[PDB]
Design an enzyme around this catalytic site. Sequence first.
Site, PDB file in Angstrom:
ATOM      1  N   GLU A   1       0.798  -1.229   0.000  1.00  0.00           N
ATOM      2  CA  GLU A   1       0.000   0.000   0.000  1.00  0.00           C
ATOM      3  C   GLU A   1       0.831   1.280   0.000  1.00  0.00           C
ATOM      4  O   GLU A   1       0.295   2.351  -0.272  1.00  0.00           O
ATOM      5  CB  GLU A   1      -0.948   0.015   1.209  1.00  0.00           C
ATOM      6  CG  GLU A   1      -1.912  -1.164   1.256  1.00  0.00           C
ATOM      7  CD  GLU A   1      -2.601  -1.316   2.596  1.00  0.00           C
ATOM      8  OE1 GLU A   1      -1.952  -1.116   3.642  1.00  0.00           O
ATOM      9  OE2 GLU A   1      -3.799  -1.663   2.601  1.00  0.00           O
TER      10      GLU A   1
ATOM     11  N   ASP B   1     -11.576  -6.473  -1.892  1.00  0.00           N
ATOM     12  CA  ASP B   1     -12.551  -7.558  -1.841  1.00  0.00           C
ATOM     13  C   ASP B   1     -13.886  -7.050  -1.314  1.00  0.00           C
ATOM     14  O   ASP B   1     -14.016  -5.882  -0.953  1.00  0.00           O
ATOM     15  CB  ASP B   1     -12.026  -8.675  -0.935  1.00  0.00           C
ATOM     16  CG  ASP B   1     -11.782  -8.205   0.491  1.00  0.00           C
ATOM     17  OD1 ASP B   1     -11.767  -6.988   0.741  1.00  0.00           O
ATOM     18  OD2 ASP B   1     -11.577  -9.053   1.370  1.00  0.00           O
TER      19      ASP B   1
HETATM   20  N1  LIG Z   1      -9.261  -4.985   2.828  1.00  0.00           N
HETATM   21  C1  LIG Z   1      -9.839  -5.236   4.020  1.00  0.00           C
HETATM   22  N2  LIG Z   1      -9.445  -4.642   5.157  1.00  0.00           N
HETATM   23  C2  LIG Z   1     -10.035  -4.908   6.344  1.00  0.00           C
HETATM   24  N3  LIG Z   1     -11.062  -5.764   6.506  1.00  0.00           N
HETATM   25  C3  LIG Z   1     -11.555  -6.429   5.439  1.00  0.00           C
HETATM   26  N4  LIG Z   1     -12.525  -7.325   5.239  1.00  0.00           N
HETATM   27  C4  LIG Z   1     -12.563  -7.644   3.922  1.00  0.00           C
HETATM   28  N5  LIG Z   1     -11.609  -6.953   3.249  1.00  0.00           N
HETATM   29  C5  LIG Z   1     -10.952  -6.187   4.119  1.00  0.00           C
END
Ligand SMILES: Nc1ncnc2[nH]cnc12
Lengths: 223, 231
Positions: free
Chosen positions: A11, A191
């Site tokens: 990131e 996601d």
């Molecule tokens: N990228 C993410 N960060 C934190 N919690 C999550 N739950 C599903 N995806 C996530």
Amino acid sequence: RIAVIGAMEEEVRILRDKLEQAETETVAGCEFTKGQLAGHEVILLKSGIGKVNAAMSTTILLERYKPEKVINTGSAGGFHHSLNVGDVVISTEVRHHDVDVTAFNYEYGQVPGMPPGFKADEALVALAEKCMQVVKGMIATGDSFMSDPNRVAAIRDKFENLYAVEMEAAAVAQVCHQYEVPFVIIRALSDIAGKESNVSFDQFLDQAALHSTNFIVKVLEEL
Amino acid sequence: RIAVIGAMEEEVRILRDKLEQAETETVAGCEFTKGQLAGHEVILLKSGIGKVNAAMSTTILLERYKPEKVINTGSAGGFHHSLNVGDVVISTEVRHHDVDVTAFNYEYGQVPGMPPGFKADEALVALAEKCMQQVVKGMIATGDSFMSDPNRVAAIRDKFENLYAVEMEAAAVAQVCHQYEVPFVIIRALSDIAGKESNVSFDQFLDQAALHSTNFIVKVLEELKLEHHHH
Ligand SMILES: Nc1ncnc2[nH]cnc12
Ligand SMILES: Nc1ncnc2[nH]cnc12
């Protein structure tokens, strides 16, 4: 003068390579890279994952570097049904989804002595808006990865129309709140929370970093 | 030199009155009272409630004041069935009870990049042990919630080996101290039994919990007097 905070290597690495005159320094195991981007002095911080990591790391930033504004970047889990993997979300407001002191009549998610949620900076949001798939909405944070559908369902009924979920934003905002530093969260979706989340996350984390980083670059370029 | 941290006013006011040469200063809305007690330079910090408050406030402490050791005090919710309201618990170890990143094979409560739990300082624990002569020694776990819901409590029971008490700051304090490499220990008293009549009991015995926790801490502090033993 401007700070950008990301939790993981993926990131921040994208931004870190764009920085010029880069001068990195580690404090309490937290990376602080300092350089130039879009004619800003940009303090890039890898916070690590979770509330305590983000809170500690944000506090070190604000103590040592004194940035005028703070942006939080990275991946997040999609919560609103319109959104897809890849989409970017600007924080209107930030809340804790796993805070419960309702036994003393604080509303759900509200940390005692704190407002129920933390409003992002109007100027930054307005700016981000002009550069807007990108959307604007509420982000809520907890110290858990929301892969369990039941956990996700439990959260749905607590907030008005949550957009995304992750593990740092509210810690960042809450610290900034008390230091009175403007903030905004700009994250992309790796996601959909509760749906094959971790398999999707491993698959589209780099994409989420990329989309989030690129939008931030244009916001910087525009600021 | 030594830091003691507490979340609410009731948990620090007792200590704060014992301090001499008291000089209070506020940073980010956090109170830092600095004075003398048991021949120690003691930095007293009201952290506020919750993980982020504790983490932020602990970080400010460690950045600005650089204490050699850190003690966390205040109330906590009883978890082990032997314990009663009023009892004091020394942290052997501290964990998060509401952390779940088990989707990436971290064990329950483990924050990524952190050990599964944070061991308290052996020297401080050993010292506290001596002053136990109800005081007990055991694991304390933290979450960003007041555990008044029996279901929330039951869900936690099955995750850890024999949890003693629960509260909302210890693990944030420990995790920060972990990364700064500062020795820590939690010394808290029980205001109530988690999941029982917790909030009614808490309002009733918070002052008692502050008092018992503070007094034990004073005698642990006083027990140095061990760097010399002369006087
Ligand atoms: N990228 C993410 N960060 C934190 N919690 C999550 N739950 C599903 N995806 C996530
Ligand atoms: N004193 C306390 N602190 C945090 N959580 C609790 N649940 C019950 N009592 C508690």
